[PDB]
């Protein structure tokens, strides 16, 4: 739950796209929520 926030969609593309979804907020996030 720490390496990957809970309620977040954690998926990284080999294209070099690290995206995180807020499955709670219904929002797309490009920048890692752990660094803010």
């Amino acid at each position: 739950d720490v390496p990957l926030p809970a309620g977040w969609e954690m998926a990284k593309t080999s294209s070099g796209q690290r995206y995180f979804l807020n499955h709670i907020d219904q929002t797309t996030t490009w920048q890692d929520p752990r660094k803010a």
Binding site: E9, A11, T13, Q17, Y19, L21, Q26, T28, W30
Partner: peptide, 14 residues
């Protein structure tokens, strides 16, 4: 400069 990301609907990529 990112290209549009996964749709929120259910799952990003299959």
């Amino acid at each position: 400069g990112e290209s549009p990301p996964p749709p929120y609907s259910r799952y990003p990529m299959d």
